Design a protein around this ligand. Structure first.
Ligand code: POV
Ligand code: POV
Ligand code: POV
Ligand code: POV
Ligand code: POV
Ligand code: A1CE1
Lengths: 134, 49, 189, 283, 98, 51
């Protein structure tokens, strides 16, 4: 719920874009190098916070993109937690009804049905009052 | 008293004034509020503890 | 929980607020002398206790009374919304609180014998439909200056999180006084 | 996501505090008798800065004892920073406010509906004052609403709920009452009550009659006595006029999170700047 | 005031509160378990609750004996219209007390 | 890689991975740990949010 289907895809599709460049920047750097599979384990392991994948990027360039992606994945999880708390805190019910003042009760509607016991004090409280004739 | 042929100002339409002068149709619909002071947010968190 | 529930003091709710309906000397409110607000409170028998608490503090102008709120010498100012909402929009230390009461517009007063009364009203209704009076709203009334006033959250700033900065700074200094212990320990052992 | 942590804090956290810590850690290790490749300043940075981001990345911890204590001190800062980033982020989204969709009758959606997304479907009940104003001022708008003409407020509110319409143009007083009485508070008026061509409701007394002055005086007495303030609460108020009704939940979409993709999209750019730049150092 | 049917032997079913003291019950003589719309029949029943426990205190303190009977009408009390006679009559407890 | 290493590994992942672990070497045995480590991200986010 915190994200939607497209944001789940884009986050998932962004793993494999970052994995490829981590491989390509490391492979073609001028100065152990990240193999293609090890780059994938880096991108997924950083996102999933698993320890799987022990190979960090080697080249100076692949450590910039390799470290933004660690900060991108921090914000993704921090947003999921934050948008879950917003949902759980703000998950208000359908509210309730106040005293005899709200329009939901002051003027009747067919769907709404409110009533009291026949021939009681409530009966001769509303009947006696002239504003509460509707 | 004749010192002015018109009043072009924020002059609200009132019962008392309407008996002696004729207001035009309102050029600004408004009401009465209350003006109070304000505070800039600070988050009032002393420290991390 | 702290950050969400860290809410400031709630302000007045309107004329019906018991704070000013039954006033106290520590909370002073006033309006402009000889105005429509005066004859509103004068002609209302119910709002009698409010009048006297306003009579002694009634100001001679709207600009003076607004400055009093900025100077903390006045805590409330009952006046036209079209003017107060301009001050609140421009000045970021004033806010209008409560619901509108006494909804009476602004009119162009003329003497009862005036021949222009018919044409003046028609020239005002025309300007309302033509959108002319919405232009005069835009260039003069609709500015909004700074950010809007609400229950918006406060970004965490340096004053809040300064203890954790000096803790890291303190841990740098302690390490400087701890590297010597580490070096000496090896020599002893 | 940038809303917590005023920009001075970020710079102090990660431009000043991170560098001064990394150069101290790299110098705490330099003097350690114990201190696997050598610890460098590019390994302290990659370690001190993945700690901030929930340690998910591979690292290379130091071997000195006083180097591990400083890293532990920083790893305590990283716990406090991340805890207080999420907490304020949740706070920034628990107390959020609703942002509308239409500015007004001057919006490009109304004046130029065709050259846009699937065309806006706005209409009004004809034979009234609102249709007269649109006929005169917004002449090009009026011809467009002919195909979406309704028969009444009740019918027009239904089409808004089903989806046949997406904007109903009408009197403020009627529309404000309908919004307040609406079930679910899912019909709103743009501008939170913004009104165009501001007029009022009058009593159409006979032309050149002696009752106009007395009716005008009688009405203005009701305002002074507060009688007209009681009728608004008795007859015109609704249940959707209460507060706290503008704060709801929200699925995070790509648009809300497009800012966190631009920094990732700029990382790809910056990495390729450095990647080309390195080749310009080998020459 | 609760109303429960009596036992087979004609007395009240014995029960106690959580503390252990017995529930004080009195024998009512109101209409049957069916509504008064059924043909008139007043069978003994068992009554207990706030008002009976308060009534027993009043009976003990002011030294009077009591016989309880539920309202035959089943109403609380109001003034209504007679069958076209321009007169008002009470019903229920109010019309039984008067 | 015994059953006392998987349990220690899968417990630590649930608890923010702070503990030392011993990851497996099989390719299909790392997909499962990654699948579980996605559950551990959801659980901890759901625990803190409701808390
Ligand atoms: C926080 C930690 C970060 C972790 C991030 C990891 C994320 C990586 C995962 C990326 C995969 C993304 C999957 C989402 C697809 C949903 C599609 C769908 O039907 O959505 C619908 C909702 O209905 C549902 O809720 C459907 C549930 C689908 C279950 C998918 C689980 C995938 C499991 C296996 C995953 C294996 C992944 C790869 C592993 C090798 C609605 O969709 P819509 O878009 O609103 O429709 C628009 C309408 N239109 C189409 C007509 C225009
Ligand atoms: C810049 C823009 C990039 C855009 C993204 C491009 C796509 C990115 C995808 C890239 C994968 C393409 C693989 C091509 C080569 C495979 C053959 C091979 O040699 O395999 C090897 C590497 O193979 C891998 O690394 C395979 C990775 C695929 C698994 C992906 C999981 C999620 C699938 C999601 C589905 C799609 C989700 C969405 C994807 C769009 C494995 O074998 P080996 O390692 O030789 O084994 C011996 C070991 N030794 C050599 C040490 C002795
Ligand atoms: C909540 C508010 C406070 C926040 C708390 C902060 C929490 C973070 C703090 C973390 C620090 C604790 C980390 C572990 C401690 C050492 C454990 C250990 O292994 O012992 C070691 C001994 O080490 C000592 O004898 C040193 C003990 C003093 C530590 C002082 C830390 C100062 C932190 C406060 C500074 C900030 C000042 C702030 C000022 C404003 C032995 O290990 P070893 O390496 O085996 O030793 C032999 C070496 N050899 C084997 C190679 C030969
Ligand atoms: C919310 C935040 C999200 C993430 C933010 C960004 C994450 C980026 C962070 C990345 C940090 C991790 C990568 C470090 C790679 C260094 C490798 C290296 O060669 O080191 C070299 C040192 O020089 C350095 O360490 C230079 C590090 C430059 C960092 C980039 C600055 C701007 C970052 C923001 C730009 C991003 C803009 C777009 C995104 C905003 C030398 O290597 P060595 O081993 O020391 O060898 C020398 C040996 N000796 C010491 C004995 C002499
Ligand atoms: C949410 C709040 C916090 C909850 C945290 C709870 C944490 C609890 C969890 C702890 C898990 C941590 C590791 C446990 C020890 C494993 C080591 C071991 O002996 O392994 C051995 C295997 O062992 C087995 O075969 C059985 C392992 C059973 C683990 C017992 C868990 C009890 C949980 C009780 C819960 C109490 C909770 C009380 C709470 C107050 C290895 O043997 P080996 O000879 O090396 O190899 C043999 C080969 N073979 C096995 C393949 C045949
Ligand atoms: C010296 C290197 C080893 C790196 O640490 C170096 C990392 C460093 C360049 C990054 C890190 C975080 C960045 C800030 C993030 C957010 C904002 C808020 C925005 O509204 C204005 C910009 C600002 C303050 C960023 C500034 C740069 C920043 C401090």
């Amino acid at each position: 719920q915190p994200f939607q289907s497209t944001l789940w895809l884009l986050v998932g599709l962004s793993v494999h874009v970052v994995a490829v460049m981590l491989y390509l920047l490391d492979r073609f750097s001028p100065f152990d190098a990240l193999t293609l599979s090890s780059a994938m384990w880096f991108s997924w392991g950083v996102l999933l916070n698993s320890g799987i994948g022990e190979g960090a990027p080697r080249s100076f360039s692949a450590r910039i993109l390799g470290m933004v992606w660690a900060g991108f994945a921090m914000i993704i999880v921090a947003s999921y937690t934050a948008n879950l708390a917003a949902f759980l805190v703000l998950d208000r019910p359908e509210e309730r009804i106040t005293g005899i003042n709200d329009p939901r009760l002051r003027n009747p509607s067919d769907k709404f049905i409110y009533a009291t016991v026949k021939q009681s004090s409530v009966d001769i409280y509303f009947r006696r009052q002239v504003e509460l004739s509707t | 008293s004749g010192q002015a042929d018109m009043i072009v100002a924020p002059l609200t339409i009132n019962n008392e004034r309407a008996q002696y002068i004729e207001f035009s149709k309102p050029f600004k619909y408004q009401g009465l509020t209350i003006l109070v002071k304000k505070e800039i947010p600070r988050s009032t968190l002393d420290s991390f503890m | 929980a702290f950050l969400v529930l860290d809410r400031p003091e709630e302000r007045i709710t309107g004329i019906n607020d018991p704070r000013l309906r039954n006033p106290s000397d520590k909370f002073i409110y006033a309006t402009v002398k000889q105005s429509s607000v005066d004859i509103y409170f004068r002609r209302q028998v119910e709002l009698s206790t409010m009048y006297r608490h306003m009579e002694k503090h009634n100001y001679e102008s709207a600009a003076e009374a607004i400055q009093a709120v900025r100077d903390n010498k006045l805590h409330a100012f009952i006046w036209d919304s079209a003017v107060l909402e301009f001050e609140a929009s421009q000045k970021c230390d004033l806010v209008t609180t409560g619901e509108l009461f006494f909804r009476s517009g602004f009119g162009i007063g003329m003497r009862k014998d005036s021949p222009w009364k018919q044409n003046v009203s028609l020239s005002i209704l025309k300007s309302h439909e033509n959108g002319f009076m919405e232009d005069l709203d835009k260039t003069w009334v609709r500015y909004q200056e700074c950010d809007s006033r609400s229950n918006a959250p406060a970004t965490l700033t340096f004053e809040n999180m300064a203890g954790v900065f000096m803790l890291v700074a303190g841990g740098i200094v302690a390490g400087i006084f701890l590297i010597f212990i580490e070096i000496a320990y090896k020599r002893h052992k | 996501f940038l809303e917590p942590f005023s920009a001075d804090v970020w710079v102090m956290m990660f431009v000043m505090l991170l560098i001064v810590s990394a150069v101290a850690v790299f110098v705490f290790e330099y003097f350690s008798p114990v201190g696997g490749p050598s610890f460098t300043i590019g390994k302290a940075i990659w370690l001190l800065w993945g700690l901030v981001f929930n340690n998910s990345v591979p690292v290379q911890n130091p071997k000195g004892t006083t180097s591990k204590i400083m890293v532990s001190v920083w790893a305590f800062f990283a716990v406090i920073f991340l805890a207080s980033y999420t907490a304020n982020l949740a706070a920034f989204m628990i107390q959020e406010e609703y942002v509308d969709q239409v500015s007004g009758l001057s919006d490009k959606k109304f004046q130029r509906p065709n050259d846009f997304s699937p065309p806006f479907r706005f209409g009004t009940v004809p034979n009234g004052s609102t249709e007269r104003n649109i006929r005169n001022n917004y002449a090009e708008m009026h011809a467009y609403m002919g195909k979406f003409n309704q028969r009444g407020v009740d019918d027009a509110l239904l089409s808004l709920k089903t989806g046949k319409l997406d904007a109903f143009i009408y009197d403020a007083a009627v529309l404000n009452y309908m919004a307040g009485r609406d079930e679910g508070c899912k019909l709103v008026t743009i501008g939170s009550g913004k009104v165009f061509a501001s007029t009022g409701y009058g009593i159409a007394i006979q032309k050149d009659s002696g009752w106009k002055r007395q009716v005008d005086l009688a009405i203005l007495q009701l305002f002074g006595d507060g009688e007209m303030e009681e009728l608004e609460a008795l007859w015109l108020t609704g249940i959707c006029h209460n507060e706290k009704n503008e704060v709801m939940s929200s699925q995070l979409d790509i648009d809300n999170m497009a800012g966190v993709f631009y920094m990732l999209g700029a990382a790809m750019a910056l990495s390729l700047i450095t990647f080309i730049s390195e080749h310009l150092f080998y020459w | 005031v609760y109303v429960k049917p009596t036992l087979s032997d004609g007395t009240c079913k014995e029960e106690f509160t959580v503390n252990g003291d017995p529930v004080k019950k009195v024998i009512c003589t109101g209409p049957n378990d069916t509504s008064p719309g059924s043909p008139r029949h007043t069978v003994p029943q068992c009554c207990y609750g706030f008002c009976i426990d308060l009534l027993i205190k009043l009976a003990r303190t002011m030294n009077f004996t009591y016989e309880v009977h539920l309202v035959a009408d089943g109403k609380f009390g109001t003034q209504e219209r007679v069958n076209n006679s321009n007169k008002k009559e009470w019903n229920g407890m109010m019309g039984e007390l008067l």
